[PDB]
Design a protein around this nucleic acid. Structure first.
Ligand SMILES: [Mg+2]
Ligand SMILES: [Mg+2]
Ligand SMILES: [Mg+2]
Ligand SMILES: [Mg+2]
Ligand SMILES: [Mg+2]
Ligand SMILES: [Mg+2]
Ligand SMILES: [Mg+2]
Ligand SMILES: [Mg+2]
Ligand SMILES: [Mg+2]
Ligand SMILES: [Mg+2]
Ligand SMILES: [Mg+2]
Ligand SMILES: [Mg+2]
Ligand SMILES: [Mg+2]
Ligand SMILES: [Mg+2]
Ligand SMILES: [Mg+2]
Ligand SMILES: [Mg+2]
Ligand SMILES: [Mg+2]
Ligand SMILES: [Mg+2]
Ligand SMILES: [Mg+2]
Ligand SMILES: [Mg+2]
Ligand SMILES: [Mg+2]
Ligand SMILES: [Mg+2]
Ligand SMILES: [Mg+2]
Ligand SMILES: [Mg+2]
Ligand SMILES: [Mg+2]
Ligand SMILES: [Mg+2]
Ligand SMILES: [Mg+2]
Ligand SMILES: [Mg+2]
Ligand SMILES: [Mg+2]
Ligand SMILES: [Mg+2]
Ligand SMILES: [Mg+2]
Ligand SMILES: [Mg+2]
Ligand SMILES: [Mg+2]
Ligand SMILES: [Mg+2]
Ligand SMILES: [Mg+2]
Ligand SMILES: [Mg+2]
Ligand SMILES: [Mg+2]
Ligand SMILES: [Mg+2]
Ligand SMILES: [Mg+2]
Ligand SMILES: [Mg+2]
Ligand SMILES: [Mg+2]
Ligand SMILES: [Mg+2]
Ligand SMILES: [Mg+2]
Ligand SMILES: [Mg+2]
Ligand SMILES: [Mg+2]
Ligand SMILES: [Mg+2]
Ligand SMILES: [Mg+2]
Ligand SMILES: [Mg+2]
Ligand SMILES: [Mg+2]
Ligand SMILES: [Mg+2]
Ligand SMILES: [Mg+2]
Ligand SMILES: [Mg+2]
Ligand SMILES: [Mg+2]
Ligand SMILES: [Mg+2]
Ligand SMILES: [Mg+2]
Ligand SMILES: [Mg+2]
Ligand SMILES: [Mg+2]
Ligand SMILES: [Mg+2]
Ligand SMILES: [Mg+2]
Ligand SMILES: [Mg+2]
Ligand SMILES: [Mg+2]
Ligand SMILES: [Mg+2]
Ligand SMILES: [Mg+2]
Ligand SMILES: [Mg+2]
Ligand SMILES: [Mg+2]
Ligand SMILES: [Mg+2]
Ligand SMILES: [Mg+2]
Ligand SMILES: [Mg+2]
Ligand SMILES: [Mg+2]
Ligand SMILES: [Mg+2]
Ligand SMILES: [Mg+2]
Ligand SMILES: [Mg+2]
Ligand SMILES: [Mg+2]
Ligand SMILES: [Mg+2]
Ligand SMILES: [Mg+2]
Ligand SMILES: [Mg+2]
Ligand SMILES: [Mg+2]
Ligand SMILES: [Mg+2]
Ligand SMILES: [Mg+2]
Ligand SMILES: [Mg+2]
Ligand SMILES: [Mg+2]
Ligand SMILES: [Mg+2]
Ligand SMILES: [Mg+2]
Ligand SMILES: [Mg+2]
Ligand SMILES: [Mg+2]
Ligand SMILES: [Mg+2]
Ligand SMILES: [Mg+2]
Ligand SMILES: [Mg+2]
Ligand SMILES: [Mg+2]
Ligand SMILES: [Mg+2]
Ligand SMILES: [Mg+2]
Ligand SMILES: [Mg+2]
Ligand SMILES: [Mg+2]
Ligand SMILES: [Mg+2]
Ligand SMILES: [Mg+2]
Ligand SMILES: [Mg+2]
Ligand SMILES: [Mg+2]
Ligand SMILES: [Mg+2]
Ligand SMILES: [Mg+2]
Ligand SMILES: [Mg+2]
Ligand SMILES: [Mg+2]
Ligand SMILES: [Mg+2]
Ligand SMILES: [Mg+2]
Ligand SMILES: [Mg+2]
Ligand SMILES: [Mg+2]
Ligand SMILES: [Mg+2]
Ligand SMILES: [Mg+2]
Ligand SMILES: [Mg+2]
Ligand SMILES: [Mg+2]
Ligand SMILES: [Mg+2]
Ligand SMILES: [Mg+2]
Ligand SMILES: [Mg+2]
Ligand SMILES: [Mg+2]
Ligand SMILES: [Mg+2]
Ligand SMILES: [Mg+2]
Ligand SMILES: [Mg+2]
Ligand SMILES: [Mg+2]
Ligand SMILES: [Mg+2]
Ligand SMILES: [Mg+2]
Ligand SMILES: [Mg+2]
Ligand SMILES: [Mg+2]
Ligand SMILES: [Mg+2]
Ligand SMILES: [Mg+2]
Ligand SMILES: [Mg+2]
Ligand SMILES: [Mg+2]
Ligand SMILES: [Mg+2]
Ligand SMILES: [Mg+2]
Ligand SMILES: [Mg+2]
Ligand SMILES: [Mg+2]
Ligand SMILES: [Mg+2]
Ligand SMILES: [Mg+2]
Ligand SMILES: [Mg+2]
Ligand SMILES: [Mg+2]
Ligand SMILES: [Mg+2]
Ligand SMILES: [Mg+2]
Ligand SMILES: [Mg+2]
Ligand SMILES: [Mg+2]
Ligand SMILES: [Mg+2]
Ligand SMILES: [Mg+2]
Ligand SMILES: [Mg+2]
Ligand SMILES: [Mg+2]
Ligand SMILES: [Mg+2]
Ligand SMILES: [Mg+2]
Ligand SMILES: [Mg+2]
Ligand SMILES: [Mg+2]
Ligand SMILES: [Mg+2]
Ligand SMILES: [Mg+2]
Ligand SMILES: [Mg+2]
Ligand SMILES: [Mg+2]
Ligand SMILES: [Mg+2]
Ligand SMILES: [Mg+2]
Ligand SMILES: [Mg+2]
Ligand SMILES: [Mg+2]
Ligand SMILES: [Mg+2]
Ligand SMILES: [Mg+2]
Ligand SMILES: [Mg+2]
Ligand SMILES: [Mg+2]
Ligand SMILES: [Mg+2]
Ligand SMILES: [Mg+2]
Ligand SMILES: [Mg+2]
Ligand SMILES: [Mg+2]
Ligand SMILES: [Mg+2]
Ligand SMILES: [Mg+2]
Ligand SMILES: [Mg+2]
Ligand SMILES: [Mg+2]
Ligand SMILES: [Mg+2]
Ligand SMILES: [Mg+2]
Ligand SMILES: [Mg+2]
Ligand SMILES: [Mg+2]
Ligand SMILES: [Mg+2]
Ligand SMILES: [Mg+2]
Ligand SMILES: [Mg+2]
Ligand SMILES: [Mg+2]
Ligand SMILES: [Mg+2]
Ligand SMILES: [Mg+2]
Ligand SMILES: [Mg+2]
Ligand SMILES: [Mg+2]
Ligand SMILES: [Mg+2]
Ligand SMILES: [Mg+2]
Ligand SMILES: [Mg+2]
Ligand SMILES: [Mg+2]
Ligand SMILES: [Mg+2]
Ligand SMILES: [Mg+2]
Ligand SMILES: [Mg+2]
Ligand SMILES: [Mg+2]
Ligand SMILES: [Mg+2]
Ligand SMILES: [Mg+2]
Ligand SMILES: [Mg+2]
Ligand SMILES: [Mg+2]
Ligand SMILES: [Mg+2]
Ligand SMILES: [Mg+2]
Ligand SMILES: [Mg+2]
Ligand SMILES: [Mg+2]
Ligand SMILES: [Mg+2]
Ligand SMILES: [Mg+2]
Ligand SMILES: [Mg+2]
Ligand SMILES: [Mg+2]
Ligand SMILES: [Mg+2]
Ligand SMILES: [Mg+2]
Ligand SMILES: [Mg+2]
Ligand SMILES: [Mg+2]
Ligand SMILES: [Mg+2]
Ligand SMILES: [Mg+2]
Ligand SMILES: [Mg+2]
Ligand SMILES: [Mg+2]
Ligand SMILES: [Mg+2]
Ligand SMILES: [Mg+2]
Ligand SMILES: [Mg+2]
Ligand SMILES: [Mg+2]
Ligand SMILES: [Mg+2]
Ligand SMILES: [Mg+2]
Ligand SMILES: [Mg+2]
Ligand SMILES: [Mg+2]
Ligand SMILES: [Mg+2]
Ligand SMILES: [Mg+2]
Ligand SMILES: [Mg+2]
Ligand SMILES: [Mg+2]
Ligand SMILES: [Mg+2]
Ligand SMILES: [Mg+2]
Ligand SMILES: [Mg+2]
Ligand SMILES: [Mg+2]
Ligand SMILES: [Mg+2]
Ligand SMILES: [Mg+2]
Ligand SMILES: [Mg+2]
Ligand SMILES: [Mg+2]
Ligand SMILES: [Mg+2]
Ligand SMILES: [Mg+2]
Ligand SMILES: [Mg+2]
Ligand SMILES: [Mg+2]
Ligand SMILES: [Mg+2]
Ligand SMILES: [Mg+2]
Ligand SMILES: [Mg+2]
Ligand SMILES: [Mg+2]
Ligand SMILES: [Mg+2]
Ligand SMILES: [Mg+2]
Ligand SMILES: [Mg+2]
Ligand SMILES: [Mg+2]
Ligand SMILES: [Mg+2]
Ligand SMILES: [Mg+2]
Ligand SMILES: [Mg+2]
Ligand SMILES: [Mg+2]
Ligand SMILES: [Mg+2]
Lengths: 185, 275
RNA sequence: UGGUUCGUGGAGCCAUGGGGGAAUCUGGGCGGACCACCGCCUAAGGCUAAGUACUCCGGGUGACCGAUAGCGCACCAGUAC
RNA sequence: GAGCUAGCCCUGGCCAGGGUGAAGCUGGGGUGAGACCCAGUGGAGGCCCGAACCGGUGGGGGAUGCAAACCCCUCGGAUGA
RNA sequence: GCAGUGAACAGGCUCUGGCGACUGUUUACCAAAAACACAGCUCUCUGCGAACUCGUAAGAGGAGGUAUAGGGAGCGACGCUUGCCCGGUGCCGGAAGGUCAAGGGGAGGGGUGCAAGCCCCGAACCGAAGCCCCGGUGAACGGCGGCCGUAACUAUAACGGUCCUAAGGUAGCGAAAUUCCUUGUCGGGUAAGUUCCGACCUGCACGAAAAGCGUAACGACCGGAGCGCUGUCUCGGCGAGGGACCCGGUGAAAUUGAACUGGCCGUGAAGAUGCGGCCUACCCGUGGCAGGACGAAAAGACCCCGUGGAGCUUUACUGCAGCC
RNA sequence: UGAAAUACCACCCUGGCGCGGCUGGGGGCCUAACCCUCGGAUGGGGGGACAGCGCUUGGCGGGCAGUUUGACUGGGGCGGU
RNA sequence: CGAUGUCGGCUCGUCGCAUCCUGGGGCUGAAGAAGGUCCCAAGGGUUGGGCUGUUCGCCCAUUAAAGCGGCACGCGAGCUG
RNA sequence: CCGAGGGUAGGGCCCGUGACUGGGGCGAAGUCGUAACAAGGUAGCUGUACCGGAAGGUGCGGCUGGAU
RNA sequence: GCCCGGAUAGCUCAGGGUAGAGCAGGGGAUUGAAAAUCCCCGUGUCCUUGGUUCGAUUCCGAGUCCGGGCACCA
RNA sequence: GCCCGGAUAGCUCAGGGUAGAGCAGGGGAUUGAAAAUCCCCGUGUCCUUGGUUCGAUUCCGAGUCCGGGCACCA
RNA sequence: AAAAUUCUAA
């Protein structure tokens, strides 16, 4: 257990919650130049639904348009009906082993809920972080007690946990800050 | 049926005063009253030995006949029934045709002007008094001598009574109000019937004052003192008792049987009380 | 339980709150648990001078003070306050 | 030492004025009879306003004071624990 | 007539939360409160020469009362309610048993004496309370979990596997008088709101009589907003009187090593009128301001030290009253 | 045929009683000690050899009392020693 | 430690320059305007408000600009508290 | 004098809207168990009260639209 | 940081030369199929080291990591 | 360091002539199952050692461990 | 007078 291995465990534990944030931020119709926003979507490959990250290649050349480079042209028609799926309200062109999707300038009705979406995913990330930190102090409550460790020691172990916790918070604040300016841009 | 009040003051919402409807005489018999010495709970040392007593309305003690075996076979007329500030019960004024007047506790149903009388041969009837042995088993009966010629001591409060559960030797078996089954001597008198003013239990002293009138000072919680003052004292902020909750003097108050164990009266108590 | 030098010690003696409880000299206590031998002493009623202790008082005397000393008070002080 | 202060006991005393208008009573309505409603009367209450009186909220002043806890402005209770 | 309670005496108000029902009570002399008290609800002890309290006792108080009464404890009008855990602790019940003191009992040994004897020691066994043991007991003390994985699609888990517990927090409430991260996130109000109100639930560490959530009314209590009005402010001015100032009279105080007591850059026990170098500076007052004299005042009250002291606690130790 | 012979005696063992002797425990009743009570008292009624009190035993025993509650230490504590 | 009164604010300032505006410059990936960076420069200046005890910082509306620091985190025998 | 209207104050109704929330509907190759229809394997329904992941269980009383 | 335990297969465990149990796993059966049941089958330097005995999971020393109890903060 | 005790099979147990008792286990009857019921049987220096009586788990002596009991601790 | 659950389709 011990300290260094508790910090590495912590910094590790907090990273997973941070990357999870980045996942949640790409997969939104951001500035909509993102490729990974369309990378996860329910399709219909041979009756069964599966994620298209085992079906096609999303690549974002220019920002205003986007291509969903596929390798199965009977799946592109399964994808095309799955892009025309309730949500994005986009009119893609298809075939010629091609599948283009141009992106309109985000309206103030969708721009309204985009920022609102970003900050929401933002706070939940932090609560993921903070809830881990409390897990870490309880790991420290026992670990100090179990090991008969000093008092002024177990004080700094707290502050050293705060230092660590204000790490993953500032990045999390910076992630959702940038992703916003791409929506306001 | 106690009297209630429309809430013109916030104490008056739930205050309740007695219906007072059994009372005829609104002033006491002069030959039968005497002053009640008010202690404030202090002994012949002026050291308090009952806390939170004193400050009540003045009281004139009315001389009560607890030993109706005094005048035997002498009938007497129920002159009046009046308020006694020294008990729960109501009192009855007795015009002994003998020419003497007397005060007794007023059983319920007893009506002004009727006759009553002591005597072994007395009628088993509301107000009459007899040795228990000559009272039939299973009669509701109050004001009972505990030992012969040692005066009424049991069921002297409103609505409280006793019942006979049987006989045995020179004793008879009584259910007290507490629910105890006691053996009392047969030659002890008893007034048949139960004490009146049954509503007394359902009086709502309404405010803080009413308790000051009854001579009852405020009762300061153990928790509110300091360890100097009490066991329950001390403790930053509020605190739970933190020990078997105890008296000021330091004895447990949550189920600590306190009666003397070797008390010779125990041989005559068939059963402990109920509930 | 106290007392004695004796703090429970091998703990006698002297004393005595509780229980038990005799005998009249061939009776009784003691001599450091106890036993015996050898000795000493006569408990359970009382009184008794002197030699001893103190200094309100009175006298005598100081390698005692000399008014911030010497008694708190040399003086109208246990007063004034 | 309870001539301050605390409680209790004994015996007396004090609380301008004004506002509110309970139960009860009577009459009217009402019904089989009531419940009830209403009208007048009445005058209850740890009710209201507010002097004495008892307090002592906020503010300023006072700080070798007028004062070893005071003064001014403001405020709380004011028939009752 | 500017103006009529013509002068004097005589509420600013509304909206919205928190705490406590309320009128009261309190730290005489820094706290008036949310604190105590309060009706009211619950547990419990008490059959009377009551329990309890004061006292060595006598004797009182309880009460010239009597289970609708008296004491002890907690909670705190009222509204709806108050869940599980009795393994420990407490209490209550338990004529079995285990242990257990004095005493009894004297198997059996010892001292001594020629001896009759005198003296001590002493096993099994009988032998109370207490304890153990057996139950009951929460408005008695008290306590009310962890981890693995899980659905057409993710995070999510109604389900479910499993470890521990005496048993794992029901209702209701929740960034709260409690939330560390925290100015959490969203909503309101504002031009802008770490406070405030409305929400969410990630309750560091709410929760059901140390009550839980609400509630009309009440409050010199503690928040937030708005109207009215203003010297609170921009930002200050002027005027009044009592002081302050001058004259006459009377005349204190703390403090005071001595004084012939400048600024700066250094130095010095590390913050110099007083030591070095330099600059500045004629003798003596009065009215004014406070930066310095580590100014005054109080043998620091914080911090430590002392085989100092005191109040308080308890399953520290040893006793003592009390009760058995 | 028995390891141990049966008939009468004798001292003893595993037990069971029958009384006698000394002990110990229960239960019940009694009254006169002792307690309470009865305006009446050298008495009546109630309790009753229990309760109460004295000596002695063991216990429960913050209700109260006397005390203890270590040092080192880059202040003390806490961790360590 | 026989006491050097400790956060913040108000009042009054005064100094430093690692300069926020302002004045003088070199270079510039300096067309111009407007910026970046370094150099010189302490004469003057450096707004009002919401929030919270806050310094800080966030936000509002401005401006040439809303500089950073010292003076016992300047300043309580000056005030607040 | 009255008077359109203006303004101050306090009320009533209606509509739009609101963080958050409470259930309701339509979906379907799910997760979960399997209540009703046979006595559906505990006869069902029912008003109520309490509890329970969920359908439901249970207490009291009722109905036959309950079987032998 | 000292005193009671613990370790023994994949997990959970009970036991002076010996080898078990329950069910995760793989099968077989009862069903028209899947259910929960019914039977088999694997699985162990019996934690490392060291010392007793003819031989030790079994006795003991030393630990290791764990349930901790108490004491520490108090 | 006194006292009171027990060692009887896989676990737990009652018992001068003698060797038992229960569920666990194995077989078997019934069971589509869980069981439950039912018939058959073991698993023994009756702790060591030693001593009595004709011999003895049975009485005693002395030992080893565990269990409880007690008081004490310069 | 009963120990035993569940069922992708034109
Ligand atoms: Mg430190
Ligand atoms: Mg009323
Ligand atoms: Mg009345
Ligand atoms: Mg009456
Ligand atoms: Mg008279
Ligand atoms: Mg007297
Ligand atoms: Mg006196
Ligand atoms: Mg009957
Ligand atoms: Mg009753
Ligand atoms: Mg009631
Ligand atoms: Mg009274
Ligand atoms: Mg009361
Ligand atoms: Mg109280
Ligand atoms: Mg207090
Ligand atoms: Mg005191
Ligand atoms: Mg006192
Ligand atoms: Mg105490
Ligand atoms: Mg105390
Ligand atoms: Mg306490
Ligand atoms: Mg307290
Ligand atoms: Mg607290
Ligand atoms: Mg007795
Ligand atoms: Mg002595
Ligand atoms: Mg002695
Ligand atoms: Mg002696
Ligand atoms: Mg002698
Ligand atoms: Mg002689
Ligand atoms: Mg002799
Ligand atoms: Mg003698
Ligand atoms: Mg002698
Ligand atoms: Mg001698
Ligand atoms: Mg001698
Ligand atoms: Mg002799
Ligand atoms: Mg003699
Ligand atoms: Mg004598
Ligand atoms: Mg003599
Ligand atoms: Mg003499
Ligand atoms: Mg001279
Ligand atoms: Mg003199
Ligand atoms: Mg002189
Ligand atoms: Mg002089
Ligand atoms: Mg007085
Ligand atoms: Mg007085
Ligand atoms: Mg009036
Ligand atoms: Mg009226
Ligand atoms: Mg009428
Ligand atoms: Mg008419
Ligand atoms: Mg009528
Ligand atoms: Mg009033
Ligand atoms: Mg008022
Ligand atoms: Mg007057
Ligand atoms: Mg006065
Ligand atoms: Mg005042
Ligand atoms: Mg004042
Ligand atoms: Mg002042
Ligand atoms: Mg005022
Ligand atoms: Mg006033
Ligand atoms: Mg008033
Ligand atoms: Mg009055
Ligand atoms: Mg009064
Ligand atoms: Mg006018
Ligand atoms: Mg005026
Ligand atoms: Mg007015
Ligand atoms: Mg006025
Ligand atoms: Mg007014
Ligand atoms: Mg609220
Ligand atoms: Mg308010
Ligand atoms: Mg309010
Ligand atoms: Mg609040
Ligand atoms: Mg209040
Ligand atoms: Mg008072
Ligand atoms: Mg005060
Ligand atoms: Mg006062
Ligand atoms: Mg004071
Ligand atoms: Mg005050
Ligand atoms: Mg007040
Ligand atoms: Mg007593
Ligand atoms: Mg005393
Ligand atoms: Mg006493
Ligand atoms: Mg006493
Ligand atoms: Mg008495
Ligand atoms: Mg009296
Ligand atoms: Mg009491
Ligand atoms: Mg009470
Ligand atoms: Mg009571
Ligand atoms: Mg309370
Ligand atoms: Mg109720
Ligand atoms: Mg328990
Ligand atoms: Mg218990
Ligand atoms: Mg129990
Ligand atoms: Mg139970
Ligand atoms: Mg008991
Ligand atoms: Mg013991
Ligand atoms: Mg003995
Ligand atoms: Mg003896
Ligand atoms: Mg003896
Ligand atoms: Mg002998
Ligand atoms: Mg011998
Ligand atoms: Mg000899
Ligand atoms: Mg013995
Ligand atoms: Mg015994
Ligand atoms: Mg016993
Ligand atoms: Mg028990
Ligand atoms: Mg138990
Ligand atoms: Mg509860
Ligand atoms: Mg908790
Ligand atoms: Mg899924
Ligand atoms: Mg999944
Ligand atoms: Mg909790
Ligand atoms: Mg909940
Ligand atoms: Mg919250
Ligand atoms: Mg917030
Ligand atoms: Mg709330
Ligand atoms: Mg913390
Ligand atoms: Mg905010
Ligand atoms: Mg906000
Ligand atoms: Mg909004
Ligand atoms: Mg807004
Ligand atoms: Mg806003
Ligand atoms: Mg906001
Ligand atoms: Mg809130
Ligand atoms: Mg809690
Ligand atoms: Mg509680
Ligand atoms: Mg509670
Ligand atoms: Mg409360
Ligand atoms: Mg609340
Ligand atoms: Mg309500
Ligand atoms: Mg309210
Ligand atoms: Mg008030
Ligand atoms: Mg207030
Ligand atoms: Mg307010
Ligand atoms: Mg001004
Ligand atoms: Mg002026
Ligand atoms: Mg002037
Ligand atoms: Mg002058
Ligand atoms: Mg000079
Ligand atoms: Mg230097
Ligand atoms: Mg210098
Ligand atoms: Mg110089
Ligand atoms: Mg100078
Ligand atoms: Mg010089
Ligand atoms: Mg110089
Ligand atoms: Mg010159
Ligand atoms: Mg001057
Ligand atoms: Mg100054
Ligand atoms: Mg001055
Ligand atoms: Mg000073
Ligand atoms: Mg000092
Ligand atoms: Mg000091
Ligand atoms: Mg000091
Ligand atoms: Mg102080
Ligand atoms: Mg000393
Ligand atoms: Mg000391
Ligand atoms: Mg003192
Ligand atoms: Mg402890
Ligand atoms: Mg006594
Ligand atoms: Mg007692
Ligand atoms: Mg005889
Ligand atoms: Mg006998
Ligand atoms: Mg008898
Ligand atoms: Mg008499
Ligand atoms: Mg008499
Ligand atoms: Mg008798
Ligand atoms: Mg006795
Ligand atoms: Mg005594
Ligand atoms: Mg004793
Ligand atoms: Mg003890
Ligand atoms: Mg003490
Ligand atoms: Mg103790
Ligand atoms: Mg001493
Ligand atoms: Mg020590
Ligand atoms: Mg120690
Ligand atoms: Mg130290
Ligand atoms: Mg050393
Ligand atoms: Mg240190
Ligand atoms: Mg050092
Ligand atoms: Mg240091
Ligand atoms: Mg330490
Ligand atoms: Mg230390
Ligand atoms: Mg200092
Ligand atoms: Mg010094
Ligand atoms: Mg000084
Ligand atoms: Mg300071
Ligand atoms: Mg600060
Ligand atoms: Mg600071
Ligand atoms: Mg310069
Ligand atoms: Mg420069
Ligand atoms: Mg630079
Ligand atoms: Mg620069
Ligand atoms: Mg420039
Ligand atoms: Mg340039
Ligand atoms: Mg170039
Ligand atoms: Mg240019
Ligand atoms: Mg250009
Ligand atoms: Mg640069
Ligand atoms: Mg400048
Ligand atoms: Mg300058
Ligand atoms: Mg400047
Ligand atoms: Mg504002
Ligand atoms: Mg503010
Ligand atoms: Mg603030
Ligand atoms: Mg910063
Ligand atoms: Mg900064
Ligand atoms: Mg600022
Ligand atoms: Mg911020
Ligand atoms: Mg510019
Ligand atoms: Mg510019
Ligand atoms: Mg600009
Ligand atoms: Mg700035
Ligand atoms: Mg500004
Ligand atoms: Mg400056
Ligand atoms: Mg600083
Ligand atoms: Mg500074
Ligand atoms: Mg600093
Ligand atoms: Mg400073
Ligand atoms: Mg500053
Ligand atoms: Mg400062
Ligand atoms: Mg200063
Ligand atoms: Mg100063
Ligand atoms: Mg303050
Ligand atoms: Mg009009
Ligand atoms: Mg108009
Ligand atoms: Mg109009
Ligand atoms: Mg309007
Ligand atoms: Mg309107
Ligand atoms: Mg929304
Ligand atoms: Mg659906
Ligand atoms: Mg059903
Ligand atoms: Mg079914
Ligand atoms: Mg069914
Ligand atoms: Mg039903
Ligand atoms: Mg049920
Ligand atoms: Mg049909
Ligand atoms: Mg394993
Ligand atoms: Mg330590
Ligand atoms: Mg402790
Ligand atoms: Mg030994
Ligand atoms: Mg079986
Ligand atoms: Mg089959
Ligand atoms: Mg020992
Ligand atoms: Mg089925
Ligand atoms: Mg299914």
């Amino acid at each position: 257990m011990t300290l260094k291995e508790l910090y590495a465990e912590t910094r590790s534990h907090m990273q997973k919650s941070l990357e999870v944030l980045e996942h949640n931020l790409a997969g939104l119709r951001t500035g909509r130049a993102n490729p990974a926003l369309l990378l996860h979507l329910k399709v219909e490959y041979y009756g069964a639904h599966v994620p298209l990250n085992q079906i096609a290649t999303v690549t974002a050349p220019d920002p205003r348009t986007l291509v969903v480079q596929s390798w199965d042209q009977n799946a592109l028609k399964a994808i095309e009906k799955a892009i025309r799926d309730s949500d994005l309200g986009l009119n893609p062109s298809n075939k010629g082993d091609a599948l283009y999707i141009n992106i309109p300038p985000l309206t103030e009705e969708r721009r309204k809920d985009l920022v609102r979406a970003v900050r929401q995913y933002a706070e939940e990330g932090r609560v993921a972080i903070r809830n881990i930190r409390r897990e870490a102090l309880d790991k420290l409550k026992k670990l100090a007690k179990e090991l008969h460790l000093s008092e002024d020691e177990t004080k700094r172990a707290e502050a050293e946990i705060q230092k660590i916790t204000d790490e993953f918070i500032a990045k999390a604040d910076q992630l959702a800050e940038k992703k916003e300016q791409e929506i306001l841009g | 049926a106690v009297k209630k009040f429309k809430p013109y003051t916030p104490s008056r919402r739930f205050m309740t005063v007695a219906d007072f409807s059994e009372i005829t005489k609104t002033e006491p018999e002069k030959s039968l009253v005497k002053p009640l010495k008010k202690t404030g709970g202090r002994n012949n040392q002026g050291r308090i030995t009952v806390r939170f007593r004193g400050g009540g309305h003045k009281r004139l003690y009315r001389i009560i006949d607890f030993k109706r075996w005094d005048k035997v076979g002498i009938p007497a007329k129920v002159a009046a029934i009046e308020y006694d500030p020294n008990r729960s019960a109501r009192i009855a004024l007795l015009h002994y045709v003998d020419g003497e007047k007397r005060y007794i506790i007023a059983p319920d149903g007893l009506q002004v002007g009727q006759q009553v009388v002591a005597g072994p041969d007395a009628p088993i009837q509301v107000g009459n008094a007899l040795p228990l042995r000559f009272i039939p088993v299973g009669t509701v009966v109050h004001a009972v001598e505990l030992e012969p010629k040692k005066g009424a001591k049991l069921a002297r409060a409103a609505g409280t009574s006793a019942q006979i559960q049987g006989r045995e030797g020179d004793y008879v078996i009584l259910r007290l109000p507490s629910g105890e089954l006691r053996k009392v001597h047969g030659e002890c008198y008893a007034t048949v019937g139960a004490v009146g003013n049954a509503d007394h239990k359902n009086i709502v002293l309404g405010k803080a004052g009413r308790s000051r009138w009854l001579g009852r000072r405020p009762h300061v919680r153990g928790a509110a003192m300091n360890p100097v003052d009490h066991p329950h004292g001390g403790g930053e902020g509020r605190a739970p008792r933190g020990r078997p909750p105890a008296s000021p003097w330091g004895w447990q108050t949550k189920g600590l049987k306190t009666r003397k164990r070797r008390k010779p009266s125990s041989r005559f108590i068939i059963a402990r009380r109920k509930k």
